[PDB]
Design a protein around this ligand. Structure first.
Ligand SMILES: [Cl-]
Ligand SMILES: [Cl-]
Ligand SMILES: [Cl-]
Ligand SMILES: [Cl-]
Ligand SMILES: [Cl-]
Ligand SMILES: [Cl-]
Ligand SMILES: [Cl-]
Ligand SMILES: [Cl-]
Ligand SMILES: [Cl-]
Ligand SMILES: [Cl-]
Ligand SMILES: [Cl-]
Ligand SMILES: [Cl-]
Lengths: 159, 159, 157, 159, 156, 159, 156, 157, 156, 159, 159, 157
């Protein structure tokens, strides 16, 4: 296909591709974080078992929803969503966290991971605002407000 | 009633009436587009019949929700929503599209119509932002993000 | 090569019935739009009650519109599907800027009276030509709308 | 066991038995048609598989409900509903249609079967009207109105 | 001017409304009888028939509501007192039926009357083009014919 | 059929029959009241039509449930519940109230009827307490508490 | 200081808790008997009674839970072993009841005992102002009185 | 002209009971607000468990508040319906900045103990004057809250 | 290359598919018989058995669908005509059964055949490692064994 | 705890505390308004009783949802939500409104109260925008758009 | 009542009775275990109260369903299921465990009980396999797979 | 001190089975990711049908992943829980940029063929060592996936 000044949804192509690149790095972080959270669910031991087995599942279920919506936003911008483990490991800032078996280590892992997601989502929000990409802005807004609330709760548990 | 500087919801009257005028032109486009989409539903033939009879119904059902919310926003701004076929035909940019019986013509009709809605919604969003009409902005934001996603899907089908 | 259509009915009578059904559809469409207007524009202490009631009514009209268009298709005919087409064919007039409960409610009685008369004429034609599927549709619409006209009129007493 | 002028529901015995006989011939046709449609469901192949495996299930599910009601109407007229494969095969006009594995063959088989059913139901409706058997008439009216709509859809797919 | 509110002939509609009111009286006495069957059943059929009688009177109650509303729709007054119903009904009050067969036979006999009356109303409505009334009768007849088959099967 | 000192539920036969007689008089009042309220539902006209057609249906629906329970309480006491219109008309204090077509008339009819029911239920409650018939007492307690609330609401509407 | 955790008299509450525990023992043996009725029924009443017995034991199980919790609420220990229940119960173990009438009569007789015990507890709770216990008894009595009417109607 | 009120009860006794019920309502209202505070402010590893539990509890209090106000109305009396009114009448004190599970849980035991005592006094008055509808309400509240106090206390052991 | 689409032995799968087709023929004749039992029942068992027969044929229909699909899964052709079924079935057409015991006995005898055939198929599938077919048989056997206990309890 | 430049969710501490202060004043207004609306529900008399008893309940139910979300946003900003009647009475602008028994007085009370909420929410929205507090902005946006719609409806009723 | 070579389901009578005897011993163990677990539910105290009052209810609810199915399997084999407390106490290996009021004691009691049940079920599975009793085998397979998972969870909590 | 594990099975055989199950899990994980890709990247007139179908399929894989990991835990073993671990162990290769229905559908057939073979080997090992819980899991997966492979293949004919 020939390059076009505007994409199918009527946004500037260059600016949309920059946004999609940043969204793809975000998606990489989500994917590694989701995997870590699945591990937290599986591997928890001790008297927090039932509570946190269930909490971690709630948390990764909500991440999975976001992963779906994020890949769709990338497609919506006429860009390619990263869709391999190898690709995600190359791009992610969040590290693989394995053999976390205690509530506090897993919960702190979540806090630290969400702190990266929030930071990256605020940067994307700002960039999207600069060019009037309201669809991308709106998505980041939703993610930020939800995850700020969650970060409050996780930190409350850890006090 | 005497003219007032601010309307019942506490927004500037003049600016609200300008926004309502633009919203009413949008509503006209929605109404003609909805009608076209009902036609697409009724008149589809060939092996895409079941799939697209159902898809077109999904699409016009979602448009009807938006039409409802848009007329209510106009009322909320203390303005009059256009509420006649004659009025809508005078104001709409989207043309009446009749006797579309094939999937591709109908699907392309949708793409082209949504492209007008998105363009008009972005203009309204910008105007609303200029005066701090957050309620109107928020509505446009919702419509844009949803319809961008749909435009991606429709164009995917057409590839 | 055959005097009958896809579903096995006489083609000429089916086209005659489809034409009548299309004129009925035009009336429904203008009527539905008027009713949307009644819903949006109602003011005064009847606001919540009638905002809800008018929504119930136009919702039910919408479903009937669906079924009518499909009945026209079922008779191998073309359903009208444009505002410009409906305005040319409809007897029911556009009714705008009705903001008072009694105005709007009387409008509904007046429109359903037109629909009922039209539906009865179609029912008679369908019955005498053996189009039971069209007759049955008209029967459902008539019985439901007679009940509704009783209620609307009751409210207006 | 003594012959009676009127049956338990108060209709003429002779006229009701004639109607029951015609309804039993209808039931025979439904049953072979149902079996054929089950076959269409099971045997479809190629890219229409998911869509038509589902659509054929919808269709035979609806036929099954009509078979139930028809048999009960025959019982309601104080008559014996046919209830054996061998009986149905003797009485049915609709033939067994096996090894239909493509959409068009199966869909055309449905149009052809419904065409027979419609004709037969109209004949029963007319007979029932002659003697005032409203309960039988009303059943035929329901079946005709629903199957006419279906035939429109099936034919649309085949265009 | 020549028709009632719903566009039908006034004289014909009043005649139909009168017949429907007599029908309503019969339904009301029958419903009461069936409540009694529900309450008073004894024996090993208790659970099954206590439930079955409730199902039957529940369906009658729905029909009663629709009948009254059809009368109102025809611009007539639905009878709405026990004393009015007792004057108009053909179905007799049936008390102290405690046996499954007695109560079930009672239902068969009562439905016989409803079906007969409904068929007469259907015929008259058809004659005069009152499709809304015809359609109601048609629904009631087809449902009750089915029920009469079932009740009689139980009694065999 | 031999008279017994105690009934099947283990209460005194004589005292239970006296309670059953009072409950039957209550049932007679409920039944006439229910019929009146059905009439109010059917016959309302004017601008209260939708609101009161609905409210009267709610009210008679609740009465019907109480009629069911009362009759079953009478049976539970090994007594015969009245089950004929002619019986109810002989025993009821509440009179037939026909051709009530306006909100105030019908709503005042409900206040007046419930006032009779409340008085009667309180008398039965007191009698049941005298001999320890807790099952009857508990039924009256439920009916009183619910109908007092209702009377407040009906009277509020009438102000 | 003068009352237990919930503000009632300690001695009175212990007396009520003891009676409630004896009640619990009876419910538990009765529930077991009713499970057996469900499992072992034979004959043409199989489907109806297999279902009806399940309904009855399901409701008993709910009452068992509430009883134990009321005992706990009174700061007492609910009995919670088969051996304890067998020592305390008046209702006897009923095994190998395979006939509808035998099992249904068994239910009538068992409920007779529950109702008697519940009425005694109600009286004592009323005397001492234990409304929470009174209210529980009231609910159980009214429900079971109804059931006893139904069971006996079936047996007529 | 009559010593009795709309619902047929003695007016003097009904006003006495309504006054007591209003003081009960005041206590409920302050207690509900404290419980909202417990829900918002809990910290530590009991966070999710108690955030949920405190919500369950104040939700149930809210429903009881509804019903109490309506019972007061039903007795032809005026339900208190202002914060300033509740603070003047309540015995239960405002309890703020409770961030620890045991603090908050013990607060709940302490408040329900006050409610139970108050409800028992009303129950007794209602029973001796024949106000069965008020008695019945109190009965429901007492039985439910005795069970709850058992549970809360159990958690604290 | 050595296996069918799902990775099983072709010859073994065709042998299993043949047996499953004979099973399908039996289910289809049995289902038809059970529809007849539902329609034709008379007497005081009418409501209970009209319902019970419907429950039983509903469950058979589900099994029929799964059987045909298992045959297809094994790359074979499911029989799909009445004339094919009548040629293959061992269960005979049973018409004009109007009595509860006759129809219930009919069900017992038919399930006897299904269970026997299912056990043979299970054994063969186990021998050849066709776990998917084994698992289907296992489910059908366990369900139908339970049902046979219930049907026989009713007949006692 | 030592003062920190940024809070747990990664926002500037000082700016977040200013926002939380404004949010707490908003919460005070909500709480007094909710209480007033409960009074409106309880105390309504006359023929609007059923309609407005139900409407006022809808309205206070929706306020309660907002109160919950607002206190959680304050916590999310690492601030203390006001949680006493005394505190709310000190901070609120909306006055206690008691003994409102007529539809128009209660409905006007609602209009006037919502007008304060909207005004305060727009101010908070603006402040939050100035520092990029998107989570707070998004909440205000939701509240404004919903309450503007409601204000339209309430004023419609009052016309 | 005459002894038969095969039972009603068509299996060997002798082998089925041996299996029924082993299943009855299993049922005895389930019943004592269930009673113990009910006790754990009722008697828990301390800060695990809400979590374990709920978890123990889940566990005994599941046991109850298995008790139902086991008894019915025994009946299906034409055998008499034990159905008395005194019978269960004679046959059970699992002992009565009363006055368990702490999480660890109760949770360890569950591990110990399930360990007995698993061993017993494996023995029955093996016996059933010897003679081709697939229906009994399949029941044991379900119980084993579910209880192994449970034991993992209970042990995790205890770490 | 014992040759058996927490759930009563032989520790050595349980570790052998857990290792095989972990390699199965690795395959599932790569396969699930490929299927997500198929869902996101499909284009052409099969878009809606396959976007839905691929979602149904990866949803079902996700549940199986859950259960597999838990079965590994149940055997007192460690489930692999990192992308890097799965890529080292998986036989199924990453399959990216599949935008055509037939490509993606054939990919699914090819992957399920690998899973089925692997599951059959585990089933055999579990059966011969008496691990009925593992055998049962494999049985469920095999029967469901054989049916799915029939359907997918049918679509491709
Ligand atoms: Cl990639
Ligand atoms: Cl206009
Ligand atoms: Cl047109
Ligand atoms: Cl036959
Ligand atoms: Cl009258
Ligand atoms: Cl009587
Ligand atoms: Cl004990
Ligand atoms: Cl106040
Ligand atoms: Cl064949
Ligand atoms: Cl504060
Ligand atoms: Cl025993
Ligand atoms: Cl790993």
């Amino acid at each position: 296909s020939n390059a076009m000044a505007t994409n199918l949804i009527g946004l500037d192509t260059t600016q949309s591709q920059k946004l999609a690149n940043a969204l793809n790095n975000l998606l990489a972080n989500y994917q590694v974080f989701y995997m870590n959270t699945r591990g937290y669910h599986w591997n928890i031991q001790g008297k927090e078992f039932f509570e946190l087995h269930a909490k971690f599942e709630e948390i990764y279920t909500d991440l999975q929803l976001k992963i779906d919506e994020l890949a769709e936003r990338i497609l919506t911008l006429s860009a390619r969503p990263m869709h391999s483990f190898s690709g995600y490991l190359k791009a992610a800032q969040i590290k693989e966290h394995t053999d976390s078996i205690d509530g506090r280590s897993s919960m702190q892992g979540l806090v630290d991971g969400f702190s990266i997601l929030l930071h990256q989502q605020r940067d994307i929000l700002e960039l999207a605002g600069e060019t009037g990409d309201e669809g991308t802005s709106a998505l980041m807004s939703d993610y930020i407000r939800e995850q700020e609330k969650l970060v409050w709760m996780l930190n409350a548990w850890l006090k």
